[PDB]
């Protein structure tokens, strides 16, 4: 199943991006006066609300590499959601042409 390979890998990729992104955000934001994304617990929640595109604004990067990490977290969460949605649609379609009599 190709659609389950792409969705399954993207979700694994997303988890790696969320954890590494939380780590790399703190590493890139510290050293910049005024930054508030400087502790791992709340940086872990920031990566989730970034990947899900919620983006409250309570937490955000101010540096270049912090923003580059943010972009990666944005793209990873969006593409993973696009692949899973696509994989679900083909799963339902193939399931629907079955149950009738089409294999």
């Amino acid at each position: 199943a190709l659609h389950w390979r792409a969705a399954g890998a993207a979700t694994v990729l997303l988890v790696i991006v969320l954890l590494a992104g939380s780590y790399l955000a703190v590493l890139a934001e510290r050293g910049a006066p005024g930054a508030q994304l400087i502790t791992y617990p709340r940086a872990l929640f920031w990566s989730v609300e970034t990947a899900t595109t919620v983006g409250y604004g309570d937490l955000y990067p101010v540096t270049l590499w912090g923003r580059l990490v943010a972009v990666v977290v944005m793209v990873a969460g969006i593409t993973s959601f696009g692949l899973v949605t696509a994989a679900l649609a083909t799963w339902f379609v193939g399931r629907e042409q079955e149950r009738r009599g089409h294999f």
Partner: antibody, heavy 118, light 108 residues
């Protein structure tokens, strides 16, 4: 079981340098930050800089003059601070502290009494 | 950066009396304040992390409160071992800063 072990004291000639150490026992996570705090006799706590040994990146206090250079050795779990070009104004007690990346200093060292005199 | 002002410099109190130190920040820092104790010729010791939450090993005598720009460390019934220097530290913004400190003295 002192988590952060520092030498007792260090004597430095005016204008010379010294390499302070901070051997770390206990749990050593990849999210650990080692902070260095300067304290003069009869004075308060002053933040010098931080370093994450798992990555090797260090930040410093911009409001003061850069006298320190932070390094680390993951194989021996020991962070180092290089105080260069010392005067009498650099004579103080230097602590090292371990932060779990959650903001607070959970454990402190005994402090190293650095004296700059001829 | 964020300056932390501690008042008063020296705090006199009678034994068995509830005392309170004050830590105030230049700007709103939520609850990201931490309290430390330093006795004579000793190293700082964490008493309170994140304004109100306690630390294992530290007596229930110590308690903290406040948010925004006004923080308070209280001691129910001060005894002799409480005589030390108390500092507050913020972790809301980079860089971490310390308070000027408050010395506690007991009027026995």
């Amino acid at each position: 079981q002192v988590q952060l072990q520092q030498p007792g004291a260090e004597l430095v000639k005016p204008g010379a340098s010294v390499k302070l150490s901070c051997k770390a026992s206990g749990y050593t996570f990849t999210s650990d930050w080692i902070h260095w705090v300067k304290q003069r006799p009869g004075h308060g706590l002053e933040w010098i800089g931080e370093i994450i040994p798992s990555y090797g990146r260090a930040n410093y206090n911009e409001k003061i003059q850069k006298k320190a250079t932070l390094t680390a050795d993951k194989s021996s779990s020991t962070a180092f601070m290089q105080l260069s070009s010392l005067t009498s104004e650099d004579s103080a007690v230097y602590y090292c502290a371990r932060e779990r990346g959650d903001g607070y200093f959970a454990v402190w060292g005994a402090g190293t009494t650095v004296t700059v005199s001829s | 950066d964020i300056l932390l002002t501690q008042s008063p410099a020296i705090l006199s109190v009678s034994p068995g009396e509830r005392v309170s130190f004050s830590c105030r920040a230049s700007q709103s820092i939520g609850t990201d304040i931490h309290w430390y104790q330093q006795r004579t010729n000793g190293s700082p010791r964490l008493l309170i992390k994140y304004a109100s939450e306690s630390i294992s090993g530290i007596p229930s005598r110590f308690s903290g409160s406040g948010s925004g720009t006004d923080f308070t460390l209280s001691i129910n019934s001060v005894e002799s071992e409480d005589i030390a220097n108390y500092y507050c530290q913020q972790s809301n913004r980079w860089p971490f800063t310390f308070g000027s400190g408050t010395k506690l003295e007991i009027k026995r």
